[PDB]
Amino acid sequence: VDRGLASANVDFAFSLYKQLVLKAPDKNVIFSPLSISTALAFLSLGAHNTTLTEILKGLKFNLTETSEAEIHQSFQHLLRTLNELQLSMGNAMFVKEQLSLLDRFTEDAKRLYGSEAFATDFQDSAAAKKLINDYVKNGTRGKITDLIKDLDSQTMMVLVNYIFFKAKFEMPFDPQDTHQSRFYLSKKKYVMVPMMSLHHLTIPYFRDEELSCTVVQLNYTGNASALFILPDQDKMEEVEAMLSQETLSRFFDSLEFREIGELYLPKFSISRDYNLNDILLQLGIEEAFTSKADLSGITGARNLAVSQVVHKAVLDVFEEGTEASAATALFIPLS
Amino acid sequence: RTIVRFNRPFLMIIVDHFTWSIFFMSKVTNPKQ
């Protein structure tokens, strides 16, 4: 484990989370921070000067402790380690067929991020959109099929990351024990939802009396698990106020095996679609979006700039396990 | 004797122990979408 990379990605996950909640503080949230970190790190491979340092600092790296090369190497090592359960991540670039790219960039993009270069006729707008969405559908096994909605005819490249996850609970719920039960959207508003249940369960457990929340971990068959954080009623805002790498680590470190009388978990499926421009600007990635953008590591010229960053993610939780998928796309016209 | 009832908004974080990566982060405020 490169501890430096692991730390940066967790910090970036909680910064992103807070910004996503700031948009609409009472709505469902689902995203893949790993997908977004990897897509932006891929982008930084082609960046120089202030454009580059802003991306890498935005991703929460300390450029003083680590070099650009070591960061790309850490992501290469991460991607190889990730790809029992089903898990895959992919990177791609879709490039205007005539656009001249540096050999060193396409070679490095393939070697470090596993990325191919797809020739694409962006002026045939609808066919380019179908080529990209098809790539994402394939990578996500049909879970994400409309990441690209609009696509300007003068786009020069689109960088794409996807992640697909499908795992079985090692202690699965029995659908015979799924019953409609109340879910309290607030203290005074509640609806009936399908509520799964498990009886007499020994799982890692931690009651945080100071933060008024209960933490449990449900393992999947692989090396992956789901950490669930359940704030007491009306304590969600309080618990969100403490979220950080340090707090999450303290949560994991405080888990102990404990026999649960019963566990009730809703069966649910949620989906969210985000434009990340405002959030990336807030996190300090600014020059990439302006005419001062320096993506000359891609083409040999300061001729490219980012116009749009979008992210789509889905999460399905059911008796047998969990399915989750996400994709990130970066739209890059001429500067 | 303990009962854990996810009948109110909660967070779910899918993690990989080998790499210490967060794959997905989620807040469920309404499971009826």
Ligand SMILES: C[C@H]1c2cccc(O)c2C(=O)C2=C(O)[C@]3(O)C(=O)C(C(N)=O)=C(O)[C@@H](N(C)C)[C@@H]3[C@@H](O)[C@@H]21
């Ligand atoms: C998967 C880890 C993780 C992933 C993503 C973000 C994180 O913040 C973490 C952790 O902090 C982990 C730990 O702190 C451990 O407590 C942790 O530090 C630890 C260890 N071996 O050092 C463990 O293996 C874990 N538990 C106490 C037995 C636990 C880890 O599972 C997680």
